Amino acid sequence: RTPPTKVSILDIAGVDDTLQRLLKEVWFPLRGGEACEKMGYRYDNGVLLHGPSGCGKTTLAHAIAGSIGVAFIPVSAPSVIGGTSGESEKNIRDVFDEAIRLAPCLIFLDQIDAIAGRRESANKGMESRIVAEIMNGMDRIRQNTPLGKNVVVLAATNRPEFLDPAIRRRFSVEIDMGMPSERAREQILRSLTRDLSLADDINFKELAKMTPGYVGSDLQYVVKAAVSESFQANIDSLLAQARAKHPVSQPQRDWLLLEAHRDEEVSWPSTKITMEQFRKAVSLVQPASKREGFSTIPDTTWSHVGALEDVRKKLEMSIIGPIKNPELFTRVGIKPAAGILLWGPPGCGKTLVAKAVANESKANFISIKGPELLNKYVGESERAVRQLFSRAKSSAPCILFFDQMDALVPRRDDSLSDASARVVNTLLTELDGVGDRSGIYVIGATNRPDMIDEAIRRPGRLGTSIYVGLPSAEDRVKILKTLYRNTVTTDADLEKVALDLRCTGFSGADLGNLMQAAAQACLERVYTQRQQKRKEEEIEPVITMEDWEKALNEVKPSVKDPEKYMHS
Amino acid sequence: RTPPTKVSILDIAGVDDTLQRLLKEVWFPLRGGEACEKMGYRYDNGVLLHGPSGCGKTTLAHAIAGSIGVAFIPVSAPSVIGGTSGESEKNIRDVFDEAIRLAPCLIFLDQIDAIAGRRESANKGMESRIVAEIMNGMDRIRQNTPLGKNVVVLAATNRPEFLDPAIRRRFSVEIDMGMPSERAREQILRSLTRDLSLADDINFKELAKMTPGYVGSDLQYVVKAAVSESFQANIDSLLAQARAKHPVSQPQRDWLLLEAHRDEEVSWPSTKITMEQFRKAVSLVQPASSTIPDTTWSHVGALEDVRKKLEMSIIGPIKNPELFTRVGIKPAAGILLWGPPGCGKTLVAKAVANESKANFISIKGPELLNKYVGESERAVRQLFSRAKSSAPCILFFDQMDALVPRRDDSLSDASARVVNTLLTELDGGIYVIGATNRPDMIDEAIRRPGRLGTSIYVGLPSAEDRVKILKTLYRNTVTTDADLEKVALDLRCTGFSGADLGNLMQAAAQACLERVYTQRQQPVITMEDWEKALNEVKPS
Amino acid sequence: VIGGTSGESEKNIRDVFDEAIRLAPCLIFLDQIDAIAGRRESANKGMESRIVAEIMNGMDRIRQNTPLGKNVVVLAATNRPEFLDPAIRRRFSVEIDMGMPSERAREQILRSLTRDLSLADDINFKELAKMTPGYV
Amino acid sequence: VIGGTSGESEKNIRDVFDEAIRLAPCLIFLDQIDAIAGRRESANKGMESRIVAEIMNGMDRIRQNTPLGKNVVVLAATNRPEFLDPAIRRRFSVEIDMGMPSERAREQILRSLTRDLSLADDINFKELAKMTPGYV
């Protein structure tokens, strides 16, 4: 009945585009209805707020309500149910009547989908009647009003697709708040850190750059996480007092020490948050978008990738580059989104560079292991693909890595069945929806490009093809040095091993097998070495040049026909 | 659950064989139960009606119910299923109990296949339990009914094979409502047009001949379409009366004119439906099921020798099935047309199909070959599966030498499996026509008598025949006739077949469009258009 | 047996076996038992498994709660014995297969069916039996 | 159509086809019939499967319970012709495709829509019709 005059517009930031639409669609036909009365125009606009969960929908609808000043009727869907089938409609009939009786008025149906789901699956009689009562109540607004003191019903929900189409048709105005951009997140961070003590090194613009895919709720956790880091020094001092009072692992003792006193509360000095604590806070906070379905960042760096300079240049100029400098690349017409289909013989490093790109781009990473999205139920197999891109867009920039993609988009022959074709078509449409300025970088890897659909390789789709093939003799030297370096002979002996004619067809995996064979040959030599020198555990196994000599003899290339993989 | 005395026996026709069985299997153990009572034997008969959809299954069960007069309980299978799993059996247990409580009674389980499906593949618990509930409710009828009165269960379904064998066994009487024949469709058409005013030219036998593959529902649309055409004259007269009363587009005014009077009613003269409107109505109505070709003998030029052979082995034994059957002339399963390609083998097969008024299916060669072990033979069997259902039907296998090669030692196991399937189906009102240009490669078991043992050679025209064909082609699309003689007698058409002459006419037509285009930059088909058409058309 | 709510369906089975124990000696006839005793392995659900588990519990109480003086026999009939759950099928000590009748059986069946009727002395049931090969 | 009971919804429908027949001739308008008469292949809801049966049965009673010349015509309008049951769309022989309005028609719509509003004098309801060739 009264506005909630405790949250203001200043407390909600980053919604500048959303607040612009809400000015001419909610505020105006609630306070300046006289102009509409002079104009003679009924306002039947049902304003619907939708977007990712945590974007500040509930808070905004309460901040707007407190600012407009007109009578406000907050409605919570679970609180509508009282304990009787007929009483549920009584609560709804007591809202649309009260708003009409107290027009102009604002109705907020928070979590509308909790009582406005799909009626097709609504088997229960009570559930299907609440939707009918709600939808009829909107027509009464258009009828029982002077066409001047309009009543606007505002509904907020994080699942706009769950609304009954009988209801969503009645909500003409739909406001997609979406996720805030880099400029918007800076505004939120400044707004959030307004009652706190801060240092001078805090660059909120820098903080916004390295928090992609965060929403207003997620940015609140980053501030909250940084506050805890600011109090870390005030806990160690509290721990030290407990240690000095008392003459099991260390963390357990800390709980036991603080459990002891529980009454001798000591003053926490009022320190301020530095910039180093904010960087620590961002790492500790996982955004709500990255909670589910996002793979862990691989441990592979460019130091783990030997040679492949041509592939590295293409990857550092099409994916890693645009992620680091989205403005430098967009000046030369390089859009911050790409689709790359890595292909080549097996064992040559297609997955290795994709794991290095995911790790060297510092961006979000989603990995799909072949036909991981297929499900035995109807529609759920296709919904997984659509939901896959529903989070890749929300967490842009994001890297989608389809490993062994020939199993997910096979050639649409007669022997395909009406289950994977429905997924290939869905995957084709989603790749079309990936905008040039969307921020999704799709990487595909397959070792049999002759079995992958040719429709996936068109522009807009995975139209960029990078060939990863067998290394040359000079190329294997970089790879063999890279492999030996990452496991610890020096580097001059590695050139002799890699340039040997017995490694003519070796791929990247074969060179790794060569090193493992030499390592096993060392241990066999060590086992006999420690039996002649002993009959004390001080034996030193070291990979010697003679171990490489017998490793070259017993290792053959895993690739049979190198030219079999150059045909597509 | 009272019997509706709405649809009568007169309103259901063409079921004379069906109505004879239903008299001693439904009427007797519902009205004359006393005779069973004296003998002391309950008569429990579950009558099952099945056939193509639209054959008049639902209507028959309601016409019988209204004539018997006993209590009737219409049951629709989808409405039995309720929101709760246990409520579906509740609906069924409230039916078989009600019939027992209200014996004698008639139960109509319309669309039984919607719930009495095969519980084997119906692995879901509710699906497999409806069938069990149905079967137990029928046993209680045999057990708990009195000796005096019987309860008859009538089931209708268009897919009798989908029924659970535990259920189809409970329906002893099965009536397969096939599709009506020419004699039967005439009875249906007369029954539908019984309360209407008709003219004298209406030949119901002619209507039945030119409506093959139609069912009772389709024939109701044909009657409904002809009735609307019959009222077209009654609307123009109605519009003129409104115009004469009142001195915005025209259709809007017509609505406004008729809104004026309303309560003021003027007489509609009682006109009658002619036969020409019935012929128009049939064309406008597309049956749910192929279609008689539009090619007549006026589209076929010359080929009189081929026509006589075709008019004596196929076309004749269709128009007068009794005149030919009087002298012992069985309708040969078909004709094996052969000759060079492009000479009118498919054209004449479409002409035979049109002067026979039967359905036509055309195969353009090896369309039936499949890489699988069974689908290649199933395509041939499905070809004859529809041909029987739409009898009379003409099956035309064009370039049949790729579908039935000679079963020599070098044949493998893919074409032999197709020849055998085709041989058995030809043994099983279907007129199969085959065409091939290499008769030395077709199996000799096909060309035996009873199978396609009649061979008619359709070959290249010499010179006079092309004149008739070119005149025929030009006549059906609208140069005069003196220029057509010059075109057909030109030495450049030495090897032209029927298709080449058709290609020649299209080339001349295209040459006309080039002339119109240049005329409008600075239409009658002229001789100069034929001049450049002769150059750009080859016999191939 | 099947009811609407959760425990209604399983409580109907428990009432059947408890009533038989209270009425011992008694004969339970579970007609079309394959409808409710289907293989919960392939038929994966929540109610279906609890129906099967209630019959297994029920069929064990009858052979343990009866006072050694009166016995309870459970008779079940089904066209699909393979659709029964093995935990329930194994609980029937006797399986009796009633196949299609032979020529000798068909003659006896006709006489029983043609017992309350009036027949002519010309009727030869041997001819009727021999002309109905695959009749049940 | 929706009632306070699952069976009451058909009562409301059965009170419509009966009223039109009782007050024949009459006009029944099933606006967006497909919204409650969709395909019931995946619609296992009990109410959904009974509306289609009720709709088809109500049309037969029209053909039966009328004084011949007191017909009752049921007119149905829907923007989703694909949701109709093929068992029902076959029973509707006459289909009227309204289509999209032309340039002359769109001018009337624009004038009709801007009828309760305060407008200036420069508004030429002709330029708007020219630049809306795909608007409905």
Binding site: G83 | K371 | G4, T5 | -
Partner: peptide, 23 residues
């Protein structure tokens, strides 16, 4: 008024098949 727990129908699934080739 007391809301009771009511069981409902089950979802449908997909099944793969194997097809022979005469070639």
């Amino acid at each position: 008024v007391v809301v009771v727990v009511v069981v409902v129908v089950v979802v449908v699934v997909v099944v793969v098949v194997v097809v022979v080739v005469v070639v």
